[PDB]
Amino acid sequence: GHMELKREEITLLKELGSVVKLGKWKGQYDVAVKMIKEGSMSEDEFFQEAQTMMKLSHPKLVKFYGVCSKEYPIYIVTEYISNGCLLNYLRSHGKGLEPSQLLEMCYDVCEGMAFLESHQFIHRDLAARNCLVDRDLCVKVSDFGMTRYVLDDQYVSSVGTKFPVKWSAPEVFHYFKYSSKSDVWAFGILMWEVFSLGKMPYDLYTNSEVVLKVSQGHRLYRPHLASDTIYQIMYSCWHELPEKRPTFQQLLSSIEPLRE
Ligand SMILES: Cc1nc(Nc2ncc(C(=O)Nc3c(C)cccc3Cl)s2)cc(N2CCN(CCO)CC2)n1
Numbered sequence: 001g002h003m004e005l006k007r008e009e010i011t012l013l014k015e016l017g018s019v020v021k022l023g024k025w026k027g028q029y030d031v032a033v034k035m036i037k038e039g040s041m042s043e044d045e046f047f048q049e050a051q052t053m054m055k056l057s058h059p060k061l062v063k064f065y066g067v068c069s070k071e072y073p074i075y076i077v078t079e080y081i082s083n084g085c086l087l088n089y090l091r092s093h094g095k096g097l098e099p100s101q102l103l104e105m106c107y108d109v110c111e112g113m114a115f116l117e118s119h120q121f122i123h124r125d126l127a128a129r130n131c132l133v134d135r136d137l138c139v140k141v142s143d144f145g146m147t148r149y150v151l152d153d154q155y156v157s158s159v160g161t162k163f164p165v166k167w168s169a170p171e172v173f174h175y176f177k178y179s180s181k182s183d184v185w186a187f188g189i190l191m192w193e194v195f196s197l198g199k200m201p202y203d204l205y206t207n208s209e210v211v212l213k214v215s216q217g218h219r220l221y222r223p224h225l226a227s228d229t230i231y232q233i234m235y236s237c238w239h240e241l242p243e244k245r246p247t248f249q250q251l252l253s254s255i256e257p258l259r260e
Contacts, residue, residue: 003054005066005077019073022080030080031065034144035073041145043069049145050076056119060112062132062142065175081140083133087198090128094197099225100259101137102194107252107260108139109190113183114248121147122178125163126186128193147258150180165207166200170240172209179242188237189220195230196223229258 011024012033019035036046046069053064053076060247083089086105095100109131116123123130124146132140146163150156155177169185171177189201201220202210219238222231233254239245246254 003050003066005068006068007068007070007075010068010075010077011034023077025065025077027063032078032080034078036076036077038072043074045145046074046076050097052147053144056116056121056143056147058112058115060108060138061115061142062138062144064144069117069172076144081132082135085129086131086139087128087193088113089133090194090198094105094120097137099195099227102225103230103255103258104260105137105139105194106191107134107255109141110187110248110251110255112139113142113187114252115247116143116147117180117183120149120151120180122150122180122183123186123190124148124161124178124182125167126183126190127167128198131190148178150178152180155179166202166210169242170214174215181242181245181247183240184237184248184251187248188234191226191230191234191237192220192223195226195234197225199223227258 009026011083016022021033023031023033025031028127050067063079065077130142158172158176167189168185169182
């Protein structure tokens, strides 16, 4: 098999986030190394989560390299994505970007998402916070411990980790279910985060308020940087009925003419 890496071939350099560290693998490759402490998660859950991330390999998804599981802390090793978190990037440097570059960020996410959709997986927390920006401003989605298998046009129970409600499809908070399109709703919110340069969606409202207002028909306003056509694409993601929302394949073909 091939998932286990030689721990001695990884030099830990600096803390990236909280714990993820920057490292050098074999004196040649830049890596990001997530530290799993004993008790933070079950070893069975860790193994399943690593195997799934490995399997869902795609240029627009974070590239899993391997694990170091012979002792604690357990390592999950991935590629090192230079520009960090998309949310921080939008907030720090967004103002300088061209609107075509913001649209390109949405296209990257949509491409990675159409891949997950092709394998009947959904991302349970599709948000800027779970996206990483490379040197060229290309976006990669992190799927680690966040995916769920759901048959096309079906529903499954929401039982598991509860993710922020402001990115959740109504079926999630109304019916305690995910649909194969719960993912698509969150993609619209991600698009809104991109075009608003990282503003908090539904800023002035609580989770209980959002749940109620969304149920009433309230949707996020158009960020000024987004064209009318782009806003119409994000809006289409927010249909109350999953069956009325587009697929990531349809979204990809809608985003493409607008220059990818
Ligand atoms: C927090 C952070 N991440 C960075 N890069 C990463 N690449 C891959 C990462 C990672 O977490 N992989 C991973 C995933 C996704 C799932 C499971 C397991 C793992 Cl291991 S984190 C860079 C960075 N920067 C700080 C701000 N600097 C601005 C200077 O201009 C840029 C550098 N900060």
